[model samples]
Target chain A: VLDQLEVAAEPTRRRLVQLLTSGEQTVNNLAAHFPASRSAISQHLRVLTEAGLVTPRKDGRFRYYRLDPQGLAQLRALFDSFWIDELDRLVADATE
Target chain B: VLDQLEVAAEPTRRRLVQLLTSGEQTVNNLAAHFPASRSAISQHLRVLTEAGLVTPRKDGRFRYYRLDPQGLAQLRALFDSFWIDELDRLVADATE
Candidate 1:
């Protein structure tokens, strides 16, 4: 679920992800909330998108961002493959 | 989902998350897969658990980890609070 998620490793980038998960906003709107400059926030968003965590769109003058739960779920499944296999092994053998 | 996720703001932590979401495993198993030391991976799991992203349990000589999607959903909702509202606004008036 997370190994590759390093695309979102920085504190600043994480902050940006927190802001956009539910809704989309232009750099200007989100910038107002962060101590960092608008440019920095934009950079953060770029990374999140690169990680396939959020999708962005242009609406008139505003740029919108929103969560992509399916993407997260996909990665979650990939990770689950390893976890479930090990867990099943332990569950079956108890000592294995 | 993105903002508070900064709690998971590191490559190691993200990889840990990616790994634990579907099942649980001890620090040794995970460490074997990563470039970082076992101690560093242990610390990464600590942060993920602290953020309510994963739940860890101890059995014999190992610590097991698993993902908590509900937690991610909670943050997703919190962020969604803004997105839906904005989307609702636009739907109410496309010109909006």
Candidate 2:
């Protein structure tokens, strides 16, 4: 989960994830979305792919990428793990 | 959530967070837990405090710190917000 969050937190990757969240995009489209070159976008995509945050497919000569929402859910699971008695007490303390 | 995640990902900070989970500790004690020196532990504490992942109290001349579980709850709220239709569909798809 920390890995997913760590992977998603990259400035470049965050931008890419946001872009991919809206729709599927190719490296060319993503390159244009940021100041970086196409090759830079490719590298970012590889990292995202490795983290299971993005799905990649080759369509003819163009490769497409989209957000993997379930991977993010796993990230949420990690966040959930940190919620224990301490958190409940804290929340109750906060409310009072 | 990303901010919390980003702050927590530092290797030194992660060690500190783990050490803190068991109980409150001082800079000297925390430093002993890592190869890092006392001053270095102080710096990490500052970052963790700023991120709201740790709470600090002044006891005599020694500063004590403990994990701020409520702050982590806020981080969990951020993670919860990202959950939406995409995640639902993905989870369903995965189950199917």
Candidate 3:
């Protein structure tokens, strides 16, 4: 789902990533922190939220954004097998 | 990092995801399962592995591909905050 938000090549990508990684923040929170206009932060958040990477909730006039682990887990599960063998090997190595 | 993998919009995207999600497998293993030619599966794997989504390990003549969770986690950490709020809320709720 986040592949839809995979505009990570864009400058806004890292900024959006930075905010979300930092923890929940309002539009105001991001608007204050971001280099671009408040409008731009809103736009970036919209893209991230729509793509299922972030979910926004109302806090009076403000909004808070956070990571969606289960949604991420869904995506991960969809792609889990490809990554697991090595982890399994590491575990096996540890077990030996 | 996986934005390069946004090519995932293609049918080959889900197939590659499906293969990796299911667990480690060889190019031949994918070749047997994919609707396209072995060459096509190889190409898809190439695209995914290059994007850092999958890592291929050599096992003699065969190559095994698995998911790259840490790489995914790195990307997630970069994008983690926007998804964290709700989960934190849930945790808070559970603790309360």
Candidate 4:
């Protein structure tokens, strides 16, 4: 889960996550969204890919990337972890 | 949210998150959970504290840290950002 959270920690990578979640996009389309070099962009995508959040598909020499639902689900569960006892505690506090 | 994610990226810090989420604990109790020096522990707690995830209550000379519901709510919202379109896309893919 730390690996899930670690890579998604960057705002730029998050933007990557944000856009990719909407639908698949070629690397070229993603490049336009960030003010970074090709290597830097490649590096960010690599991080996301390795973290299992982004998966790439190759077709006719072009690569398309999209969000992996499994990875997103793991992240969703992670955030939900914080909310479990929290709401309980808030109620406990309010009553006390 | 990146600050929230970045601070939470470390595995050690995450263990801190898991324990603290359960209830408030003193720095010493938290230090007992990790195999690190007091300064290192202080540094990690500092990060969590500054990120607003952990709030400290001072009693006598001791400070106890607990998960802040406000901060947890913000982080819960952050991860959901990734899921907003993800599940939608999954449904779209399945239908098509």
Total clashing pairs for each candidate: 14, 0, 17, 0
Per-residue lDDT tens digits of candidate 1, residues B8-83?
A: 5355665676676446788899888888899988887777777776778988888888766655554344334423
RMSD (CA, Å), candidate 3 to true, equals 7.3
lDDT of 1 at A52: 69
Report per-candidate TM-score of chain A alone.
0.64, 0.76, 0.62, 0.79
Segments in model 2 whose C-alpha atoms lie over 4 Å from true places: A10-23, A28-43, A68-73, B9-23, B28-43, B68-70
Recovery fraction of native interface contacts for candidate 1: 0.13
Question: What overall lDDT goes with each candidate model?
Answer: 0.60, 0.72, 0.60, 0.72
| Model 4 ranges with Cα > 4 A deviation | A58-61, A81-83, A87-96, B57-61, B88-96
Q: Point to the candidate with the largest TM-score.
A: 4
**If both were scored by TM-score, which would come out higher, candidate 1 or candidate 4?**
4
List native contact recovery per candidate, as a fraction of 1.
Answer: 0.13, 0.18, 0.02, 0.23
Which ten contiguous residues of candidate 4 chain A have the minimum total lDDT? Answer: A87-96
What docking grade applies to model 1? incorrect
Candidate 3 Cα misplacement greater than 4 A, ranges:
A1-24, A31-40, A51-96, B1-28, B31-40, B51-96
Alpha-carbon DockQ of candidate 4: 0.35
- Writing each residue's lDDT as its tens digit, candidate 2 over B1-96 gives 237656765657766876776789988888998777899899989988988889999989889999786666665554455444555566454431
lDDT of 3 by residue, B27-92 (tens): 888788767897888888788777665788998999888867644444333434333454345433
Q: Report the lDDT tens digits of candidate 4 across residue range A4-82.
A: 7667767788888887766799888888888897678878888888887789899997788888877766655555564
Q: Summarize candidate 1's per-residue lDDT along A1-96 as a digit string, tens digits.
A: 334344543556545656664566677888898788977877777667767666789979887776556545543443334233433333343221
Give chain B TM-scores in order: 0.69, 0.74, 0.65, 0.77
Q: Model 1, stretches more than 4 Å misplaced?
A: A1-96, B1-3, B78-96
